[model samples]
Structure formats: C-alpha cells, structure tokens
Target: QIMEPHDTLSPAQVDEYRKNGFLVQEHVFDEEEIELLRAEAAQEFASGGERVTVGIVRGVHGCHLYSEVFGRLVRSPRLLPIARQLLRDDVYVHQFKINAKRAFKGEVWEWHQDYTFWHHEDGMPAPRALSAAIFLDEVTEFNGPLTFVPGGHGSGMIDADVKGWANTLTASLKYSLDVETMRGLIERNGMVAPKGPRGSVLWFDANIPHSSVPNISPFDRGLVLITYNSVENKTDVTRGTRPEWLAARDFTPLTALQATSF
Candidate 1:
C-alpha cells in the first residue's frame, strides 16, 4: 500500500523500502562489469582530481561531470528506471560521489540523515529524494559498512545543530546526531548493515539515519553514491553555497542508457 506497483520493483520491495527506509539488491552487476568500475575508481583515486583528501583521497564528488564511465553508470537502465519508479516522477542527479574508505586509515561517518543537509543547506522541499549506493568493492563485516536504523526515516528530520558547510563532506558531518539521540533511536529502531559482494546496490531514503564505522580490516571499501531527486522537488538554488560538485544545480531529467553492460 506504500506505493503502486512499478515495472522496476515489486509491490513488496516498495513496501519494504517505505517501512525500513532502505533496500538492497545483490549482484546487480556481474564480476566483469564491477571489475571495470573498480579499476576506474582506482585510477581516479590515483589521479586525485576533483577529490576531497586528508593525505589520501577520501571522496570524489560529481563523477558524472568528469568521468564518462560514471556518467553512463549513473544513467544506466538498472538505476534510473528504479529511481523514477520509487520517486514517482522524473529524477535528476542531485549529488554523485565515490566514497572511498581506505584500509586501516578510513574514517568514521557520524550518525546523520542525508535530508538534513539537503533540506537546510540545499533547499530540497521534501524527502522526495533517495540515494543508490553501488558497492565498488566487497562489503563485509571487517571492512566498514554503512549501517542503517530500521524504520528510522519514519522519525522525519531529527533536529541537529548545523556544523557549517565545510564539514559536510568530511568525517565530521554538517548535521549529525548526538550520542544520546542516536542511543535512543538505536534502542527504538535497531540497526542493520547490509553486506554483500561488489556491485550490490543499497537504495536508501534521504531522511534515513545512517552512519559507517572506519575500515580496520585489510580490504578497502568503496561505494559510488548517487543521490537522485524528483524533478518536481528540485532544490532552491539560492539557499546554500555548496559547490556544484557537492550539491548540483542541474535539474535535467536523465534518460537511461539502452545497454545493460557498462
């Protein structure tokens, strides 16, 4: 009852996403395809162009703008169609980034909702956006995995202190929940970290409270995070000063590519 049946997803899947604020699809891409993406990510990290770094590249924002491979991937039939089905409208990339968690030296992301920054800073009108996080490397318990509080999105925009624009991309987030608030939420909703092989896609609501631990294992964790916003809910551009890479101004509806393989 959460959403009408769509071509890309089942009624059950849509209902699950509505209740839990997230969904995971395993093996969305095969080994060969994911390998190509992983190699591309390595190359981008080596170049350190258009990246945020603290000695090592932590993230590369707006890959669709600079990387052809990523641009196609973002517009792939596998992704855009599902996003359209979920948002129930034409969608555009609001933000795209490769979040890299290097082995041993990776940093923690504090608990926060994505919509907080999008709403307060980017002027997103509602929680009509979502992120599809495609795992570029194997996600396991050892490597840092994104943990989500089940049904937490139902809480709807938890109050948080603004930590300024500069902190948005860093490990210290721009709008993060305090330990006490997080403790209560965790007690109420609990948490689950979805782990799987490379190319798995985790679709999560923009308002879901989520965070990740640092990578202490030998394997690195990399994710291509694409946030898609409904064309009807485009942000008010004058609200914030976030760079185009971090918070895109473009609202052009994307056309999914015909090919299945990237």
Candidate 2:
C-alpha cells in the first residue's frame, strides 16, 4: 500500500523509544481538529457516557471524524514508518480502543497487560505485535492516564497477568480488593505518562505490560489505542490448515502457500 510522503523520525526520538518498543508522533492532528475532537469527546461525555468504559472493538467502521483522525493518526508517516522499520514487514491495523475512564467511587481498574488476548496462540510472536495510544485529553495522574511499567514492552506477555474491567460485584470484591493495594501498586510500578502537547501519539510494542489507574481528577481521560501487526504472522489459510500445527512444521515456503486478507 502507498503512504503519503512525509519526513520521518529524528535521532533523539529513535534513541528514546521504548527498549521493548515505542515511538511518539507529536501533534499528529492539526490544531483545529485536535480541539474539535476534544470538544466532541467532552460533548459525548456530557450527553452520552461510556457505561462500558473498557470496551474493545475489533474494527470501528463508522464515524468519518474518527476514521480520518484516530487510525490515521496511528498510521501517519511519523509513526507507521517507525513501526515498519521495527517489524520489517507489511503491517495491518489489528485493533483499536477509545479508552474512557469514568468517574465513580468504586469503579477502579487494576494493573493489567494487553497481551493476555493474543499471546494464547503459541508459536506466534507474542512480542511481535505493536499498539499505539493517543491522548484525546490532557491525561494527568488525577484524570487516570495510562501507567506503563519501565521497559514494560520488553517484559512481554503477562498471560501471567491481565483492563477496566470488572464492574460487577463479584469481580469488584476480589483482588485483595483494597485501596492500599491499588495505591501502592500505582506508586510502586507507576506509568510514565507520555509528556507532550495534547495531540501526542505514543506507539508501544504489544508485549508492554500496562494498565490504567483510578480517575480522581475532575474530567474524564480519553485515550485512543490502535494496535498494528504484520499480516505476515497470520497463517496462510490453505497451507496452514492448523495455524498452531502448520506454524510448528517447516513448510516449503510462505510464497508456495496461499494468503488472504480481511
């Protein structure tokens, strides 16, 4: 696929990227749209609220505004090239999120990892995928911005660990279920908030162990997370009848196998 020709990364940004993996594209959205989207988010929160705060949607097709901004921001020249260089293959948008942290006395989500969903597929590159999060709001510790473990991306999947989360009474009452534990966890393994203007987009590898904290701030924290993966990893449906099984054997060559796209 062709992409717009624009200047890419500088040395400093590359040097500072997450060891696991990360990239930051500054002011991806123009000044006008940035404010527009921000206002739209505020309007949504005011009129229509996210009852299911941590919901994850596979592919969001509606919203002309969102299509132009959200995913495009992630694929903008500044970011996609960096991911292309890192993965060294063709990539496709794998997932997206409009992370809304609601205001509530008891609606606190604990530390968790994103890899729990994808890593279950053995032999697949658990650490191979990548994710990007853009802050639609000025995320602060109070408003509940994302907290990332240092070198968290390098740590890889926490199939071992687990987002918003369980609002139900049964799940809420679990997890040692203490304010101290939550407080201590955040304070101990805190997230390094991506520092920049509001439109900054931070791209991180899939393996990063990250999660959100409680929103004590006055406003809601709106973050857009888009995950990307090289379509190469998906098994060739014809040759690899069993992805797990086929990936295990030394097949002739991928070129000899069939390929498909969604």
Candidate 3:
C-alpha cells in the first residue's frame, strides 16, 4: 500500500532504521501540500490552542490521510516494508500526539522521550515503543528543529515531558533553559536535525530522546507525532470503550493506541 505521495522504501531502509533509533526522509510533500497543511493549521488555531497544540485540524481526525496521516504513514504498505524489515511483523496504531509549536521566544520544549506515558501497563513504565514524527514545516538545524538523541528513548520513563513543556509555555522564562545552554548541549554533540521540506516525514522510536527549542522562525513549526505499539501490550490509563476495535465509536484512542501498539 504505497501512498501516492511517498516513494516505496526498501526492506533494507526500514530494517536499518528499526535497528537505529531514527531515520529521515525528504521532499515527501511539495510546496502546495505544505501550503495546504499550513493554511489548514491556520484555521485550526482560530478555534483554539488544542488544535494548535497537536496541529491536527479537527476535520482530519477520522480520515486515513488527514488527521490519521501519521497512523497511515507508519503502517503504509510501502513504509511498513521498511518497518517490517527491522521491527519484524505487523504494527498497531491508535493514540499519539500532534506537536504544534508556535515557538515563542521565551518558552522552549525540554528534552524528553515518549516513555513516561507509554510504559505503564498497570500504571507504571513499560518499554517497546516507537513514533513517527511527520514534519509539516521546512525544518532546518536552525529555526527550532527537533534535536534527536539516538537511543535515548531506551533510557526509561521521564515524567510529563508534554505537560512540562505546556506548563512552561505559560510559566514565563524562569523555568525554560537559556539559548546558550540549549546550543551547548546540541552543538556539543553536533545534533543532527533532519533537514526536510513540508511533506517530509521521520520515524523515531519513542525511547529516542528528542527535544526542540522555541521557534526562531517567523512562522510556526508544526508536526504530527503518532505512536505505534505491539498489539500484545496493555495500558492502565482510562478508556471509554474498546477503542482498538470500535475506534470510530469513541474518540479516546490515544491511550488505547499506545497501550496496544507498544
């Protein structure tokens, strides 16, 4: 099931990334597509920040190619060929976050992994998680690109990375780290920021530690991040229904999505 927009990735490419924590692909979307997403994002912000937070326009929520794009991308027959090469076998997706960063100068997201929420099968930590970070911006090493720390996600759970960043967004500058320090840590290791235009997508495991600075750009940095878990897994978080099977009936798929996919 190669999506019309993507080139079929080989088994080797997928295998390579499954062994590594991250992989990068480029030019997956053209300028028009980029503009399409951006304009839609603009509309989303008009209603509220929740859409701004994840950048998923409320309209795209159920469709496989729109709100569900990340889930679709991760499991794309073409994309999965690569994943199966490394991850080996089928994958499940239901819940994940859409990261929309309007990069305010004073508030930068902190370094963290996705495990803090995904690991808990019975209200605690569990490993074996991964994510696809689909970039809808022409992200560069500058202008607040996501800093990837290979293999960092395997280090175990860290509390509230998402909530922490959210809190700092309004907390003022006191809690956020200074730019020099941000640069020091990233540049010291010469962090590799995946350079891609809009429509470009990336796949990184949940355990892989990644963080971004406040946008230096005049425009917002929007990304859609969704989780993929092994079907056997279970989580202790609240659930409204058997979302895995009756997904459309209930909207609370993120928690259940993580529980099963990881």
Per-prediction TM-score to the true structure, in the order listed = 0.92, 0.62, 0.61
Where is the poorest 10-residue window by lDDT in model 2?
250-259
lDDT of each: 0.85, 0.49, 0.49
Which regions of candidate 1 are displaced past 4 Å? 1-7, 48-50, 259-262
After superposition, the stretches of candidate 2 with alpha carbons farther than 4 Å from their true spots are: 1-4, 35-75, 102-107, 121-124, 159-191, 235-262
Q: Write the per-residue lDDT of candidate 1 for residues 1-262, one digit (tens) a residue.
A: 1122222778998999999999988888788888888888777767756465558677877777778888888887778889999999999999988888888968778999999999988899999999999988889987889999999999899988666476778888878898888889989989999888888999999999998898999888889899999999999998866878888898999887763433
lDDT by residue (tens digit), candidate 2, 1-262 = 1234644566676566645355667777666756766664444334332322323321121121234444345545655665665656666555444556655321444554544444442234445667666666565557766656656555444334222223211223222223443454457555575544567777776665555556777665666565656666643334322222112332221111112341
Query: What does the lDDT read for residue 248 in candidate 2?
Result: 30
In model 3, the runs with Cα more than 4 Å from the true position are 1-12, 15-20, 47-86, 103-106, 121-125, 154-190, 234-262
